[PDB]
């Protein structure tokens, strides 16, 4: 499926996981930010590439990046 | 595919091992890349060869006895109307070919009527069908030559042989209207095994199979 | 033929050649391509 | 160690000297591959043999006496026409070359049919191989010269030799290249 | 898991209908293929290049065979000014009885199609007379196409595939191609010309049976071994000479009279003979330049690293650039395509003014079709060159390898370049549209003298410098006292001056203010297309809206609705938007060419001079006046031979409109409609048994833009070709 | 029209003398800053047949039978230059002898 990567620029407003209606992103503890949180993508095979996490990302440049390619039956959003 | 090949130095195709008789390695297009398909094509080759032998011996007899030209024999008058002749031919063949197809389904032999195999006196042996297949292939080549010499020469096989014996240097296929095309075709056929040899020498391994619409050998490529 | 011996064209060459390459050749292409794209594994 | 190819002492990288007629003549390095080397030395030997057969046919035809020269012998009246000659000419020699190639694929040498040593008389010395290779190169140069005679001088090779013998200065490259533009109109 | 995309395992895992389209589109994108190294990539490119060569030679062999079979080449040879060329016979079984009768043009029996490709003039010029020779040409080109196909098959086997460094051999490839592919090839061409076409233009048949018995020049190569090359130009062809006979002809094989033939309205054969001979000699000389195995020659990296100006003028200069061009195949492809498009544009601009084929200038529709075809080919090749340069910039470009060089410095101030290109494009468009609208409304108020007619003084000054005495400028080579006129006064001046002062030909036509306005509109089109292509190339790897464009590949849809919206952000999208401007610009140049030449052929050049100033006159006297014969192809009262052209015109309109269908609407409304159709098929009686194996999905956004551009360009080209050919051929 | 042999021989002898006695010390210095030790040198390494073709030939680096570095390749190149210059002079003389004046008047 698609590749979702989270960089160290994340500081943890825990809002990129709310904007994703596919349960792709999860939040793990960290130590490189004030909030001690960092976004992670365990179910990266269930992502379609809708880039709503990119809309929700406030850092410049974005901490979470979604890369298109290698589409499948779940990443294409077909119910058939 | 037998120690004797279609050209000296040929390699047998992988499906054409030589278990069945009459094999010479001549399979450039590889129609028979399936055992059922190969045995059906062997049956069809045997039937077309048998009908070719019958047609060739009939033409030889009719040209020897002086009966007129065979391609103009359809316009000759005959007893019994042509429409009912075709009707009774279709009617008898709808039984003959039916019995043949059922016998090939249950046995596989090329029998006749209710006797499968139709071998009353019984000299069935592998060399006999080998000779029959060779004579059959030669007969379809002969019938193609007969049609060609009816088309361009306009004479029978005996007259064509007489013209070849009268002056073989100038009375042949290559001095006719189909002459230079035949020269080009035989040049291509002379070059053809050597290009295959070069393909085998440079393509030392891999498969290098001929991938064509009529066979599914392109699936493994 | 005289002065046309490479690739001799008969008079019925267009009337015969056009329907194979507009009829039979696209059909073989369609069937071969459809068996290609639908091939599993 | 060799008699070499030309004055300067070249230590050729790929040609050690074990080849028949090896002199080190490779100013561009076309045969660095060993498979290419064996294929092309076989091709060179066959081309040399064909060159010897061609030049000897030319001098034999001219000395024996024929009404038609070698460069016009294609368009001549024979017992068999050109249309009836080229089918079997391609067929039988394609058979011969196919057998030769399918034997050379494992033997690595030449051979007419089956008996690939092809030596009923023997005397298969390396000196004979070197003589064959160099005589073939000489016949190759000779056939090139004959073709350029037929192009420029429009005359037979032995006739050109007689012309150079009778008038060495007045029938050379300069005369037939500049002084005679009428060679087309019977010189 | 399928295997139809064999090069891409991931594409084979796609269960939707997108797999077939993406497999067809990425079929020859070998750099993105799975498990592909550099050497195998180069070998596959070599095999594909051989395949394209074989396809080209097979296509031209088929053209020769079809002309020799169903053409009227002998009748064209007997009378070129009267008998029309024939391309191929028309065997369409859906044709009606009036349809068969109305297409037996050119004095033929069956339905035939009139040839506008210009091969009849070209083959009559090079000495081909009988259709037997065309048959031999067709079979020889088929043989060489088979040879090239075999060679492409040859360089894919073991012990025959060349290594990676063999392809990367830069100096020797340039040496060999310049010396042989250009030099001795042009030498063989001029040798064939002198041997065959020069005697065939003077009533002397030269063929394979007697070319060794005839002689090109009566001196017989004595000038060449001596120095007396002036003997080859001693008795040239006179003005009163026919191309099919030897009436008042001379024995000369290399001359330089210049100008055009008085009868055929084409350049002299001996002029082209000396031209290709000089080009051959110069190219063979220049091909002995780069360094090879021998101790002499030039190295490309040495010249590149040496050419660094001091005082930091170009920073590091051209250092580190040899490996950039050699390692990146897209750089070489873009350079090759840029040069090919420039040469194609030069060819288009040079055959029409200087016709190289006999009786080509008489055939108006042939010249127009040739010009328009090669101009559109040149423009598409330009767009490909810029797109592949962008592909170089995103895929294989190392700033660390070439730091501070000309490439890095051009990328350093790319905003300045893009901004200045935008400024000049905006300024040209603003002012050109201002005067065009101004002259439109001024003409509308019944007073056309108030329109702004800016006379082109620079180009008419150049034309006066090139010999046009109509403008009366006292300039060099126009006055008899100038040193430029005296130099070459007896060489080619009286031919070139006579050809350039005759207004009947296409050599340096008179230009008015409307010509100047349309030239600056053409410059505006080129400038805007350059602006968008250059901006897409420079922003291919990074931008302020999206720095990481290099990580998303060259052809990706977007980044999403975030950061305000990132639609059409890729350099592929820049190319796709630039193709429309390319189509408009080449449409402008071909509109200008066709209207000016049509008014020249009809004899009313004043109508073009007074009507090309304002756009309403442009529309009325080009798109409306010349389309009268086009739309009457199959009128209900009567139908004639222009039926294919009106049908093709409407076909181009329909395909253009289907391009609009793909271009306006975007994927996301189509996916829901396709989902409803999926529910329709899956959930109906007597058709739920039949089920798809590839899931029907909507066309992807990149695919949507590609198919919209494809239908757009196909409809554009077909409708313009139909209108141009019908309008030029209905009257003449 | 100028006789061809004397002009051709004089031009090629002058060009060979310039190449050996004049242009040779300037030679092997432009190349030393082109294919020298620390700079570019060899473009290939040499592993396969298609890669050994770009290696230098066997007869261009052996030694120098001439007192200077003038080898066979230099002899051929400067002789080609001499033939070119002689043919250029002969062509100009031929154009003058035909009554045609190429120079501006
Ligand atoms: C007589 C004295 C003299 C003069 C006049 C020059 C002059 C020049 N040398 Mg130099 N040179 C000299 C002595 C001299 N040199 C000496 C003693 C040496 C040592 C041997 C050199 C060695 C040397 C080298 C090694 C090189 C030069 C080069 C150059 C040229 C480019 C200069 C530069 O930096 O680019 C100009 C400066 C810029 C900043 C470039 C800006 C370009 C702009 C951005 C482009 C604008 C495009 C615009 C849109 C066009 C509109 C056109 C319209 C139709 C659209 C320049 C003409 C270079 C060369 O060959 O280039 C031709 C080069 O490689 N020179
Ligand atoms: C025939 C239709 C048409 C026209 C007129 C334009 C005009 C323009 N496009 Mg273009 N374009 C078109 C179709 C068209 N496009 C299509 C179909 C495509 C494919 C998608 C593109 C793709 C395209 C790209 C990709 C780019 C352009 C750009 C441009 C500009 C080029 C600069 C120029 O020429 O000076 C100006 C040209 C003019 C014609 C001036 C128009 C303004 C006049 C003066 C009227 C202004 C209003 C007037 C004063 C009345 C005021 C009131 C009124 C607003 C109600 C210009 C605004 C480029 C751009 O904007 O960069 C600077 C650019 O990058 N276009
Ligand atoms: C139509 C009659 C026919 C049929 C059914 C067969 C069938 C067979 N033959 Mg046979 N063969 C035939 C005619 C036929 N052949 C002729 C006329 C010759 C002499 C030239 C041969 C010579 C021959 C040899 C030497 C060998 C075979 C072998 C085979 C087997 C494998 C080859 C294969 O797949 O081809 C299947 C072929 C067909 C299904 C028929 C061909 C389809 C059409 C006719 C082709 C289209 C036209 C084409 C351009 C040719 C036109 C020729 C033109 C001059 C008229 C198979 C059982 C091999 C074998 O024994 O393997 C066990 C073998 O070694 N055949
Ligand atoms: C002399 C030529 C010849 C030869 C050697 C063969 C050889 C063969 N045929 Mg055949 N046969 C031939 C011509 C020939 N056929 C002709 C022209 C016909 C048509 C009248 C037949 C009709 C025929 C039938 C009906 C049958 C055979 C069968 C046989 C087998 C043994 C019987 C026999 O030798 O006869 C053997 C395969 C039998 C069989 O099935 O063998 C497989 C069988 O039932 N043949
Ligand atoms: C690749 C270039 C090319 C193109 C675009 C055409 C196009 C055409 N040809 Mg031509 N043809 C070509 C090459 C080409 N031909 C060559 C190289 C030959 C020599 C073998 C022929 C021999 C040929 C004949 C004999 C006939 C056509 C015919 C036709 C027309 C119908 C298409 C058809 O039957 O297929 C062509 C059919 C073939 C079997 C040729 C395939 C050759 C392959 C590629 C090798 C069409 C105008 C027919 C027509 O109506 O004439 C206008 C017709 O009767 N063509
Ligand atoms: C490279 C080999 C070669 C080739 C291609 C030819 C070809 C030819 N020779 Mg030649 N010939 C050759 C070698 C060759 N020869 C040699 C080595 C000799 C002995 C010195 C001769 C002696 C010879 C004579 C004496 C004559 C020819 C003639 C001919 C012509 C017809 C011979 C033929 O095929 O009859 C058929 C051959 C069969 C074996 C059957 C033909 C142009 C004849 C001719 O017309 O001269 C132009 C003729 O009179 N040849
Ligand atoms: C000879 C020059 C040349 C070469 C070697 C290449 C080679 C390449 N280019 Mg380039 N390109 C060229 C010319 C060239 N192109 C030109 C002239 C253009 C402008 C039109 C482009 C535009 C271009 C773009 C925009 C892209 C490439 C890409 C590619 C790569 C894969 C493309 C491919 O084969 O897919 C095979 C593609 C197909 C089989 C699809 C064919 C559909 C055609 C184009 C539509 C034509 C319309 C119509 C249907 C035609 C029929 C008419 C109808 C009426 C019958 C490859 C490196 C792509 C790449 O690098 O991948 C990221 C890429 O993004 N090129
Ligand atoms: C258009 C003109 C077509 C006819 C041109 C003449 C060519 C011709 O008839 O060639 C024939 C066959 O040639 C060939 O077959 C030549 C093949 C090479 C006879 O040519 P020929 O063999 O009589 O040639 C005699 C040389 N002196
Ligand atoms: C390598 C050679 C290339 C060709 C080359 O360089 O040729 C040199 C030159 C060629 O003369 P031509 O210019 O007449 O040769 C024809 C040219 O078109 C081609 O060489 O030969 C002579 O002058 C020889 C004179 C001998 C005179 C002998 C007189 C004896 C008297 C006693
Ligand atoms: C994107 C990119 C790319 C591409 C680019 C392009 C595509 C370009 C083009 C370009 C072009 C397309 C250019 C052109 C140019 C031109 C020129 C430069 C010209 C000149 C001319 C002249 C100088 C002339 C002169 C003269 C003479 C000689 C004669 C007459 C007179 C006169 C004076 C006019 C690449 C690949 C690099 C990569 C990177 C990026
Ligand atoms: C042995 C010796 C010697 C001597 C030497 C000599 C004397 C030399 C010479 C030389 C010469 C004296 C010359 C050379 C040459 C070479 C070459 C290599 C050439 C080339 C040429 C060319 C390439 C040409 C071309 C052309 C043509 C073909 C035509 C047109 C024109 C032209 C010119 C372009 C001595 C004693 C010293 C020392 C010891 C040793």
């Amino acid at each position: 499926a698609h590749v979702v990567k989270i960089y160290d620029t994340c500081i943890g407003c825990t809002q990129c996981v709310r904007a994703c209606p596919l349960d792709v992103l999860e939040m793990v503890p960290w130590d490189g930010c004030k909030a001690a949180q960092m976004a992670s993508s365990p179910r990266t095979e269930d992502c379609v590439g809708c880039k709503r996490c990119e809309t929700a990302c406030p850092t410049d440049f974005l901490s979470v990046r979604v890369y298109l390619g290698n589409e499948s039956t779940r990443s294409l959003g077909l119910a058939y | 595919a037998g120690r004797e090949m279609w050209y000296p130095g040929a390699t047998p195709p992988p499906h054409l091992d030589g278990s069945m008789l009459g094999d010479y390695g001549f399979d450039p297009l590889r129609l028979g890349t399936n055992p059922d398909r190969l045995k059906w094509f062997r049956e069809a080759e045997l039937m077309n060869g048998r009908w070719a032998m019958a047609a060739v011996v009939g033409i030889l007899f009719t040209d020897l006895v002086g009966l007129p030209k065979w391609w103009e024999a359809g316009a000759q008058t005959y007893p019994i109307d042509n429409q009912t002749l075709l009707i009774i031919e279709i009617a008898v063949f709808s039984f003959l070919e039916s019995k043949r197809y059922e016998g090939y389904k249950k046995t596989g032999g090329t029998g006749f009527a209710f006797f499968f195999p139709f071998d009353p006196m019984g000299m069935r042996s592998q060399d006999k069908e080998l000779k029959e297949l060779k004579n059959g292939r030669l007969a379809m080549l002969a019938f193609l030559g007969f049609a060609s010499t009816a088309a361009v020469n306009g004479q029978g096989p005996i007259e064509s042989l007489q013209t070849h014996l009268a002056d073989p240097a100038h009375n042949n296929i290559f001095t006719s209207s189909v002459g230079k095309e035949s020269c080009v075709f035989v040049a291509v056929l002379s070059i053809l095994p050597m290009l295959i040899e070069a393909n085998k020498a440079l393509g030392k391994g891999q498969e290098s199979v001929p991938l064509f619409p009529w066979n599914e050998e392109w699936e493994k490529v | 033929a005289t002065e046309g011996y490479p690739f001799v064209p008969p008079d019925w060459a267009p009337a015969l050649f056009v329907p194979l390459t507009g009829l039979v050749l696209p059909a073989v292409g369609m069937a071969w391509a459809f068996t290609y794209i639908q091939k599993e594994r | 160690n060799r008699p070499l190819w030309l004055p300067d002492v070249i230590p050729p990288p790929h040609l050690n000297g074990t080849l028949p007629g090896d002199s080190g003549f490779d100013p561009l390095g076309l045969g660095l591959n060993e498979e290419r080397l064996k294929w092309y030395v076989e091709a060179e030997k066959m081309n040399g043999r064909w060159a010897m057969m061609a030049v000897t046919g030319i001098m034999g035809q001219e000395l024996l006496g024929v009404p038609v020269k070698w460069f016009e012998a294609g368009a001549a009246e024979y017992d068999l026409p050109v249309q009836a000659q080229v089918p079997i000419l391609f067929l039988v020699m394609g058979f011969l070359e196919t057998k030769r190639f399918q034997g050379f694929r494992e033997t690595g040498t030449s051979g007419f049919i089956n008996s690939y040593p092809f030596d009923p008389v023997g005397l298969n010395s390396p000196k004979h191989a070197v003589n064959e290779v160099k005589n073939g190169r000489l016949a190759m140069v000779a056939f090139v010269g004959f073709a350029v005679q037929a192009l420029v001088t429009r005359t037979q090779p032995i006739e050109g030799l007689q012309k150079h013998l009778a008038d060495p200065f007045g029938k050379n490259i300069t005369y037939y290249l500049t002084h005679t533009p009428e060679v087309i109109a019977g010189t | 898991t399928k295997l139809f995309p064999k090069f891409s395992q991931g594409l084979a895992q796609d269960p939707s209908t997108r797999r077939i389209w993406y497999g067809l589109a990425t079929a020859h994108d070998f750099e993105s293929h799975d498990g592909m190294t550099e050497e195998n990539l180069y070998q596959k490119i070599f095999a594909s290049h051989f395949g394209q060569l074989a396809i080209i030679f097979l296509w031209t062999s088929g053209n020769l065979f079809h002309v020799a079979w169903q053409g009227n080449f002998e009748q064209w040879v007997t009378d070129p000014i009267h008998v029309r060329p024939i391309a191929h016979a028309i065997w369409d079984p859906h044709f009606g009885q009036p349809a068969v009768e109305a297409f037996t043009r050119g004095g033929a029996s069956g339905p035939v199609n009139i040839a506008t490709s210009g091969v009849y003039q070209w083959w009559y010029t090079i000495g081909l007379r009988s259709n037997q020779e065309l048959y031999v040409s067709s079979v020889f080109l088929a043989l060489v196409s088979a040879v090239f196909l075999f060679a492409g098959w040859l360089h894919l086997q073991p012990n025959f595939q060349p290594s990676l460094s063999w392809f990367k051999d830069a100096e020797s490839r340039l040496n060999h191609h310049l010396a042989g592919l250009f030099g001795v090839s042009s030498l063989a061409w001029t040798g064939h010309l002198v041997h065959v076409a020069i005697p065939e233009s003077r009533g002397q048949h030269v063929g394979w049976d007697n070319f060794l018995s005839v002689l090109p020049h009566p001196q017989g190569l004595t000038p060449f071994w001596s120095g007396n090359w002036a003997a080859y130009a001693q008795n040239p062809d006179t003005a009163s000479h026919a191309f099919g006979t030897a009436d008042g002809s001379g024995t000369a094989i290399l001359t330089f009279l210049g100008g055009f033939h008085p009868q055929t309205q084409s350049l002299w054969l001996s002029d082209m003979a000396h031209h290709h001979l000089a080009i051959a000699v110069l190219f063979i000389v220049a091909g002995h330049m780069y360094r090879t195995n021998f101790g002499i020659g030039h190295r490309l990296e040495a010249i590149l690293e040496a050419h660094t100006p001091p005082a930091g003028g170009l920073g590091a200069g051209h250092k580190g650039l040899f490996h950039t061009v050699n390692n990146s195949l897209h750089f070489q492809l873009g350079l090759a395509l840029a040069s090919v498009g420039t040469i194609t544009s030069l060819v288009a601009q040079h055959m029409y003014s200087l016709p190289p084929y006999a009786y080509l200038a008489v055939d108006f529709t042939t010249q127009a079709s040739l010009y328009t075809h090669h101009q559109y080919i040149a423009g598409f090749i330009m767009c490909g060159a810029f797109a592949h340069g962008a592909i170089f910039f995103i895929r294989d470009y190392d700033p660390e390898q070439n730091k501070g060089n000309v490439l890095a410095r051009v990328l350093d101030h790319k905003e300045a370049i893009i901004s200045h290109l935008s400024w000049v494009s905006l300024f040209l468009g603003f002012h050109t549209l201002g005067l065009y609208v101004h002259n439109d409304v001024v003409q509308a108020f019944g007073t056309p003298e108030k329109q702004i007619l800016i006379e082109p003084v620079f180009a008419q000054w150049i034309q006066a410098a090139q010999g046009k005495s109509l403008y009366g400028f006292d300039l060099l080579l126009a006055s008899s006292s100038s040193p430029a006129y005296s130099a070459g006064q007896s060489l080619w001046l009286p031919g070139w001056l006579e050809a350039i002062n005759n207004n009947q030909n296409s050599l340096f036509l008179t230009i008015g203010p409307g010509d100047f306005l349309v030239h600056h509109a053409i410059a505006l089109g080129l400038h805007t297309t350059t602006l968008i292509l250059v901006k897409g190339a420079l922003d291919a790897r990074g931008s302020k809206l999206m720095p990481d464009k290099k990580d998303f590949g060259y052809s990706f849809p977007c980044d999403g609705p975030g950061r305000g919206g990132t639609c059409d952000i890729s350099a592929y999208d820049a190319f796709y938007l630039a193709v429309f401007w390319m189509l408009n610009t080449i449409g402008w140049v071909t509109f200008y060419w066709h209207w000016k030449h049509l008014t020249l052929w009809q004899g009313n050049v004043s109508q073009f001079d007074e009507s090309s100033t304002y756009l309403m006159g442009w529309l009325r006297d080009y798109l409306w006046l010349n389309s009268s014969q086009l739309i009457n192809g199959y009128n209900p009262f009567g139908m004639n031979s222009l039926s294919v052209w009106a049908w093709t015109f409407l076909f181009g309109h329909l395909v253009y409109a289907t391009g609009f269908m793909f271009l306006i609407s975007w994927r996301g409304y189509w996916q829901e409609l396709i989902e409803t159709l999926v529910w329709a098929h899956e959930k109906t009686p007597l058709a739920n048994l039949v089920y798809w194996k590839d899931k029907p999905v909507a066309l992807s956004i990149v695919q949507a833009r590609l198919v919209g551009l494809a239908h757009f360009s196909v409809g554009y080209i077909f409708t313009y070709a139909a209108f141009l050919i019908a309008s030029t051929a209905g009257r003449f | 029209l100028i006789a061809a042999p004397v002009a051709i021989g004089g031009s090629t002898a002058a060009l060979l003398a310039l190449g050996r006695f004049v242009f040779l010390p300037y030679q092997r210095r432009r190349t030393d800053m082109e294919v020298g030790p620390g700079r570019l040198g060899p473009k290939t390494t040499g592993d396969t047949f298609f890669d050994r073709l770009q290696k230098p030939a066997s007869f261009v680096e052996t030694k120098s039978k001439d007192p200077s570095g003038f080898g066979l390749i230099d002899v051929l190149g400067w002789g080609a230059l001499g033939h070119v210059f002689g043919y250029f002079l002969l062509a100009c003389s031929s154009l003058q002898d035909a009554g045609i004046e190429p120079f501006p008047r």
Side-chain angles (χ1 to χ4, degrees), chain F residues 10-20 70 78-79 81-82 85:
Chain F
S11 148
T12 193
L15 265 275
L16 282 169
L18 267 283
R20 166 162 155 96
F70 216 67
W78 285 98
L81 265 201
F85 276 29

Side-chain angles (χ1 to χ4, degrees), chain B residues 8 12 38 40 57 70-71 96-97 105 152 189 200 204 208:
Chain B
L38 211 32
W40 176 265
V57 71
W70 42 287
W71 68 97
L96 283 173
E97 295 302 320
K105 252 219 150 187
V152 55
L189 256 287
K200 273 151 28 194
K204 330 166 190 307
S208 75

